Design a binder for this molecule. Structure first.
Ligand SMILES: Nc1ncnc2c1ncn2[C@@H]1O[C@H](COP(=O)(O)OP(=O)(O)OP(=O)(O)O)[C@@H](O)[C@H]1O
Ligand SMILES: Nc1ncnc2c1ncn2[C@@H]1O[C@H](COP(=O)(O)OP(=O)(O)OP(=O)(O)O)[C@@H](O)[C@H]1O
Ligand SMILES: Nc1ncnc2c1ncn2[C@@H]1O[C@H](COP(=O)(O)OP(=O)(O)O)[C@@H](O)[C@H]1O
Lengths: 735, 735
């Protein structure tokens, strides 16, 4: 009449040896309810993963609750079982026929033990059960030397009739006291790929994320493993940790890693599955999971897609499962325990869509920010992936890895794995369709498939409000020497003399204004500074922040200011301020005035932010209001006129990188002399036109001829007039 | 067949001794239904944390109904049980093994009893129970010296095998009349933090709320304790109290403290959780709650999230749970009784979001308003927090507290608590990473972690209507003596001649206006006046009142005017009046005209605000309409022009305070003489630019040289033209 539905796993206590494989503590009523003899094998469905881990069963001592079951740490780790997964029990399969080879693998060790062995076979196969796909055991105490040693038993040779049961349980035979089947120590094989066993996630897979993953590790370590330190204080420890960022950054993998590396109980909600038609069913499920987490002292709560289950209260009054659930859960967690050891993780894609009641400092104080990987992080990810896929299947060199990382500017970490997979597909196709099913070992991995993959991937990460570490070197930029020297001076003053300024009480100007021709040297300078300084860079587009709704731009400005404040000292750059600054001449609406007063208040109004640096670039400097155009804020002004010969030569070389300079025969000096009064955008347009003319001659071309460049120069005009130069000169004279 | 659903606690009547620990006046039918011996222990589920206050059971005299149960005031105080809490009976647990040490704590006392103790052990352990966490007993009557003494039994070393029992009750075995176990009279420590017992809240915990908390105390004391006070005049006592203010200020603490300190029944609704699919079920529960509250004379009603459950009728006509619940609750509260003794507390985040039908003189006339804490209140809050934290874990001198309070101009109590929490987190992680898990007591809490915490706290309360300025004294202010006696006269007339105005009929003109070139220190003088005068101030900006929603600006203006009226005679200053005033020169929406008409009607129409003083400053006189430029309303005009020679000399002192004048070699008056066409803001800009030049010339210096000041003067223009000064003089002449 008990009718058990689901079970919860639990590690075997008391340590020592005991049984350690077939504990399977089950209430006698449940033992009789399954119509299977207790002193025999048992099966744990765990709603999937067929094979069902055939293991022997044993009785309890009347102190084991029905809802829990012990499947031993070894089996829990081998089967990729995490504390909190739903477990189901049913009848057992046929008895194991026999074992053929059973050979160790010597995980994370150099092997060659011999003396250190001391008959591992006895301590390994003496246990009842011991399923042959995988055993891992603690070092215990072997001879003199202590240390930690572990072995794995992947490799198999026997054949089992039931294809559904891939776990192929085998029996153990012995002859002795205190000889296997033709030894067991051989080779240092890794996890076998034949059975496709689930390899537990580890921190080694994630690379380039070190600082914030370490911070999260500490912030999860200090509540749970050492609660007495806080219990001495007793100041309401934090329970919620924010994990948000762009999609594809790998938050799910981080959650899996922190769940696997910790033996404590965790909760994995399915999201909308908890939502039910009944009014009180959701509350019953919430209180059930909460009291389950409270009953077992070490517990962790994982919540994903908060914006879906718990949307914003004001944004949408959908009803049913709504902010009432938020209120109930907050009230429950606000008094569930004084100190305890409980961790709640809120992993959401966009905190803005989340109810701002969730984003309260009192409860959800801890916040972790995840951004798109930079060049170093991308290189680390690629190297880790190459190490994981092993050198026997590829022939690559590290310089190609830097080249690939540099070629990927806006690529996300999720894009790299797909790029590798599609490169594998391209290599497989290029081998098959060409050589008629030749051996794939020789072809391995090359660079042409990777190049084709990055050409045809077409990522959807181009549109974004924040780009992280643009890549442009000083051998690619174009500008005048005085501007470069000045920018170096005012980037080296604050970051190297903040303490000196604090001692003198003068701080930093925190304002730079740029104005010049629309060609170049006004926008690419920000990217050059971002690449050189290695500091966080914020780019804001004028028309982008404009919205039909009035007041949205104010919220965007507040959000970007908060991001700049919370994202360490950085530099803030605006692409075009001339599209929002004019509020009188342009007869703009109240939104422009609100934006102007907001930026005026944020720059030097009743608040001072020494760490951040504000730099702006504009095309026409006159329409900016005098309130913003005041010395003290953006006081520094640079004339920065049209690019000179070497800068134009440099941008021509940059545009000629795809082509070959020596094949064309151009010395880069005649073209620079001919193109002197033009602009950088005009130079790019001329290069594009010359390339089009070259490729329309005889289809694909390996080089561009000088006649095409001459035709492009003649046909296309600069479009610039001395009037704008005189206007800039007279504006600079009055300033 | 009775099927008891839930039970509510009640203090043990008749005083005396009786049981006083194990009264347990439950109906015998419930005892028989649970299949447990009446002379055995009992437990209350109270939703979660099973094992609360294992206490022996007994029977009643068939008079007390099933719903109400009694567990005595001692157990009520021990378990922090709120009156009328929902309790679910559970089966008993096996008898306690033994008591190990037993030692008193001497709550709220200096201990050292000895002579007047007179063997409290016999009376302490003669009663059944004596639980490990503690007991609370009244002083009763022992010898002479009256007064009140209480003892708690916090510290003990009893071991219990099951971790489910959170209260681990112990048995009683002592020898006495009318040899122990290692005595019990020792130490005077507080509640043990190892067992993390829930300490009830106290009025001393909340700081900086003295006036409003005393008003709330009086408002909740008038109806209940002495209903005759209000029933003598026979005008019916109020039943509802409105609590409102910024989120996370004091509401939950007020509710919890008034619930704990009052022996009356306390009931808190679950808000939207009560709402179900059945329309009539919630309303039937509402009559059930009202009948339960009316049945017992001492009762407290707590209402939360009023806006969520009772929105504005006109704002949203959704359906289902709607104004019908408002009408039924209004009818229930209108005719519950004639005099009675019942207080209803309504804590809402937004008063305007609440349905105005609720805000009625006959129902919810009483309102409690709590603003954002000022410097003094925040300092008191921080000092109370450090007092609670105690000096055994950290050291903090008073000046650091004052500096932190001054820095945290806009922080809220929740923000301060979160900042302290993540300060402790940062200290713990820093110590761990720097010393490999060293003792945290030696490192404790310093100012560096606090500074890092306030840098990375990411404040969210900056966008607030109420703002507090930095405090500046007249010595810090450099200004001319001209008009100083005038402004002293205007500030001293309403405040120090209210009776003279009332008798003579002169009243308050309430008209002060400021004008002149930007940087003429009008805002600085207003801030200095507000700081020195020691009077309440309301910070109003130009665009701040301008709201995107139609009518929101009018509501904000009405709210700020009501706050000024109810916050004693004060001063209201507009930072930028040159935005709301212009309605004819430029194209403006009808909202600006409505605001102008409303302010014109408020300043002098129909009503006169004698107590408060209206002062404003403008950047251009043409923007002010002729309607406001009339005698009686802003008739007084203060020139407050550019600073004089002596004023600029005094200004130069403040900017040079960080530097040292002696080694500079300048006389500090010749530089001021050379700078006569500038303004105070312009002088500050010149000093800042000179400091920037000094730090950019040779980095670290201890002084600014004459050459730097000369270069700053040469490179910066005054930016002021005589024509605008002439226009200002002409405008002043005509008015
Ligand atoms: N830092 C990384 N290193 C390696 N692979 C990564 C990284 N970030 C993402 N990936 C790749 O992206 C995929 C994992 O994406 P995952 O779903 O975990 O991302 P997420 O940002 O948490 O988003 P989602 O909301 O879809 O869960 C895998 O293919 C994985 O290889
Ligand atoms: N004056 C204060 N001193 C110390 N801590 C405070 C103070 N005010 C608020 N807090 C902190 O903020 C938390 C919540 O604040 P508070 O209880 O005052 O909010 P509330 O307005 O009643 O709640 P809600 O956000 O639900 O309306 C407290 O538990 C405490 O940690
Ligand atoms: N002599 C001075 N020393 C220091 N600060 C000054 C001085 N004069 C003006 N200020 C600062 O400049 C501000 C003056 O504001 P103001 O420009 O008059 O406002 P508005 O733009 O409405 O005219 C004040 O907030 C004050 O802090």
């Amino acid at each position: 009449f008990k009718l058990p539905a689901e079970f919860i796993t639990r590690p075997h206590p008391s340590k020592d040896h005991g049984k350690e494989t077939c504990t399977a503590y089950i209430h006698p009523n449940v033992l009789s309810s399954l119509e299977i003899n207790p002193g025999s094998f048992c099966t744990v469905g765990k709603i999937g993963e067929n094979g069902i881990l055939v293991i022997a069963r044993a009785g309890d001592e009347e102190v084991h609750p029905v809802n829990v079951i012990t499947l031993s740490t070894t089996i829990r780790s081998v089967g990729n079982l995490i504390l909190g997964d739903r477990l189901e029990l049913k009848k057992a399969q046929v008895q194991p026929p026999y074992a053929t080879k059973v050979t160790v693998g010597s995980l994370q060790g150099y092997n060659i033990l011999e003396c250190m062995e001391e008959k591992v076979i006895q301590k390994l196969l003496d246990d009842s059960g011991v399923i042959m796909p995988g055993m891992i055991f603690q070092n215990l105490k072997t001879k003199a030397g202590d240390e930690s040693i572990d072995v794995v038993i992947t490799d198999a040779s026997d054949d089992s009739l039931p294809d559904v049961s891939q776990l192929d349980l085998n029996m153990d035979d012995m002859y002795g006291g205190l000889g296997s089947t033709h030894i067991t120590f051989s080779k240092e094989t890794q996890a076998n790929r034949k059975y496709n066993l689930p390899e537990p996630l580890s921190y080694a897979a994630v690379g380039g994320l070190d600082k914030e993953i370490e911070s999260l590790k500490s912030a999860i370590e200090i509540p749970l493993h050492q609660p007495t330190l806080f219990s001495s204080f007793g100041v309401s420890p934090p329970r919620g940790i924010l994990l948000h960022g762009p999609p594809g950054t790998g938050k799910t993998m981080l959650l899996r890693v922190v769940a696997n590396t910790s033996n404590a109980h965790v909760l994995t909600i399915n999201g909308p599955s908890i939502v039910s038609k009944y009014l009180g069913e959701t509350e019953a499920a919430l209180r059930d999971i909460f009291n389950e987490a409270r009953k077992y002292q070490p517990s962790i709560i994982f919540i994903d897609e908060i914006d879906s289950i718990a949307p914003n209260r004001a944004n949408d009054d959908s009803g049913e499962v709504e902010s009432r659930v938020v209120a109930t859960l907050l009230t429950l967690m606000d008094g569930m325990g004084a100190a305890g050891k409980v961790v709640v993780i809120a992993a959401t894609n966009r905190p803005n869509s989340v109810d701002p009641a969730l984003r309260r400092p009192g409860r959800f104080d801890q916040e972790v920010e995840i951004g798109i990987p930079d060049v170093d992080a991308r290189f680390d990810i690629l190297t880790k992936q190459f190490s994981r896929m092993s050198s026997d299947r590829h022939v690559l060199d590290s310089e190609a890895i830097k080249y690939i990382a540099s070629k990927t500017h806006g690529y996300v970490g999720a894009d790299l794995t797909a790029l590798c997979r599609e490169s594998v597909m391209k290599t497989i196709q290029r081998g098959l369709g060409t050589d008629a099913n030749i051996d794939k070992f020789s072809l391995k991995v090359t660079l042409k498939d990777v190049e084709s993959a990055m050409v045809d991937i077409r990522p959807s990460a181009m549109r974004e409000i924040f780009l992280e570490m643009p890549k442009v070197y000083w051998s690619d930029i174009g500008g005048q020497e005085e501007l470069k020297t000045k920018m170096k001076e005012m980037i080296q003053l604050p970051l190297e003399a903040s303490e000196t300024f604090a001692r003198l009480g003068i701080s930093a100007p925190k304002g730079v204004l740029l104005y010049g021709p629309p060609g170049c040297s006004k926008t690419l300078t920000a990217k050059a500074l971002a690449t050189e300084s290695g500091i966080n860079f914020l780019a804001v587009k004028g028309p982008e922040i404009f919205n039909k709704y009035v007041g949205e731009s104010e919220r965007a400005i507040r959000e970007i200011f908060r991001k700049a404040r919370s994202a360490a000292p950085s530099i803030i750059f605006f692409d075009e301020i001339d599209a929002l600054s004019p509020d009188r001449d342009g007869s703009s609406t109240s939104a422009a005035n609100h934006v102007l007063t907001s930026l005026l208040n944020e720059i030097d109004g009743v608040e001072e932010l020494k760490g951040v640096v504000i730099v702006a670039a504009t095309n026409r400097p006159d329409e900016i209001d005098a309130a913003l155009l005041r010395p003290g804020r953006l006081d520094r002004h640079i004339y920065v006129g049209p690019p000179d010969v070497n800068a134009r030569l440099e941008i021509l070389k940059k545009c000629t990188k795809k082509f070959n300079t020596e094949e064309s025969g151009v010395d880069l000096h005649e073209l620079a002399d001919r193109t002197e009064g033009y602009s950088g955008a005009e130079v790019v347009l001329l290069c594009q036109e010359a390339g089009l003319a070259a490729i329309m001659e005889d289809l694909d071309v390996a080089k561009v001829e000088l006649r095409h460049f001459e035709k492009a120069f003649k046909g296309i005009a600069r479009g610039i007039t001395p009037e704008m130069l005189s206007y800039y000169e007279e504006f600079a004279l009055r300033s």
